[PDB]
C-alpha cells in the first residue's frame, strides 16, 4: 500500500579523460522509470518505463534542462570537495545523491529524504524534520553553514511536500497496472547431497515484485540465522526478483526443517518443506 519515489545521481571525475560523468536514474518503488547520462551521444532525460512515455514534450524538455544544470552543479561540487579535503587534482572522486519521498496508502507524505556522499562516505543529509542538516565531518559543516545561510532546507521541504508527492501520486495512477500490482513469489525446495552425512536444502523464491521479501529456515521451529546462507535479492531482468536461502542438514533429518516465506503479494506467510 505504501510507495516511494527516489532519484539517484552519481558524478564521477576522471582527470585526463574529460569532464566528470553525470548519471541520474529515477525509481518508483523498485521500478526504474527515467535515466540521464552526460556520456550519451545526445544527453536527455529518457523514459525507462512504459507508463512515463505518455508525458509530453514540456515534461522531457524541462527534465533535460534540470539534469544538464545538475551536471554542471555537481562538476563544480567535485572541484569544491577537492579543496575541502586538501586533495590533488590527479585522482578520481565520486559524489552521490539520493532524494525523494515516501507516501502511505492515502498518498500523504510519510517522510522525505535528501542525502549526499563523497567517495562512498556520508557527507551531508537533510534531517527527518526537513528543516535541519546532519554533517558528517568538518568539510560538510562548511556546506551546512552555506546551506543554512541560503535557507536550502526550506526549498527542499517545499519540493518534498509539494511536487514530489504530487508527481508520485500521478505516476502511481498512470502506472497502476504494474506499480500497484504485487507478484507473489513462486516457491520450491531443492535437495542436493554433499556427502554421505549431509545435504543442502535450498529454499527458492522466484518471480516476485516488489523486491522486499523474508526467507528463513527453522529447525524444530527455531530460526537458523547463523547457519543459513542467504543470497542478496537479485533482479531477473523482467521486473521481478529472485532470492534463495540454504541450510546444510544431517542425512535423514530433512523433515525437521521448514522454510518460511513472507511477501506483500502473499495473503499469509508460507511454510515449505522438502518434498521427496
Amino acid at each position: 500500500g505504501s510507495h516511494s519515489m527516489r532519484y539517484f545521481y552519481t558524478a564521477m571525475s576522471r582527470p585526463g579523460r574529460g569532464e566528470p560523468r553525470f548519471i541520474a536514474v529515477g525509481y518508483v518503488d523498485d521500478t526504474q522509470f527515467v535515466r540521464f547520462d552526460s556520456d550519451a551521444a545526445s544527453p536527455r532525460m529518457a523514459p525507462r518505463a512504459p507508463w512515463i512515455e505518455q508525458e509530453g514534450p514540456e515534461y522531457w524538455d524541462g527534465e533535460t534542462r534540470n539534469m544538464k544544470a545538475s551536471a554542471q552543479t555537481y562538476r563544480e561540487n567535485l572541484r569544491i570537495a577537492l579543496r575541502y579535503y586538501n586533495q590533488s587534482e590527479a585522482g578520481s572522486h565520486i559524489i552521490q545523491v539520493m532524494y525523494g519521498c515516501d507516501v502511505g496508502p492515502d498518498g500523504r507524505l510519510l517522510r522525505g529524504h535528501d542525502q549526499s556522499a563523497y567517495d562512498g562516505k556520508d557527507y551531508i543529509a537533510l534531517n527527518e524534520d526537513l528543516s535541519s542538516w546532519t554533517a558528517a565531518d568538518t568539510a560538510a559543516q562548511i556546506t551546512q553553514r552555506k546551506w543554512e545561510a541560503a535557507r536550502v532546507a526550506e526549498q527542499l521541504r517545499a519540493y518534498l511536500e509539494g511536487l514530489c508527492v504530487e508527481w508520485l501520486r500521478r505516476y502511481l495512477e498512470n502506472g497502476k497496472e504494474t506499480l500497484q500490482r504485487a507478484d507473489p513469489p513462486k516457491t520450491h525446495v531443492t535437495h542436493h547431497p554433499i556427502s554421505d552425512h549431509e545435504a543442502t536444502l535450498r529454499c527458492w523464491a522466484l518471480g516476485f515484485y516488489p523486491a522486499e521479501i523474508t526467507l528463513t529456515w527453522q529447525r524444530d521451529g527455531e530460526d537458523q540465522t547463523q547457519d543459513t546462507e542467504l543470497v542478496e535479492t537479485r533482479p531477473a531482468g523482467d521486473r521481478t526478483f529472485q532470492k534463495w536461502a540454504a541450510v546444510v542438514v544431517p542425512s535423514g533429518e530433512e523433515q525437521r526443517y521448514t522454510c518460511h516465506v513472507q511477501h506483500e503479494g502473499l495473503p499469509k506467510p508460507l511454510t515449505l518443506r522438502w518434498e521427496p
Partner: peptide, 8 residues
C-alpha cells in the same frame, strides 16, 4: 519529477 542549484 526532479527538484526544479546549491553548491557545496
Amino acid at each position: 519529477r526532479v527538484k526544479e542549484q546549491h553548491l557545496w
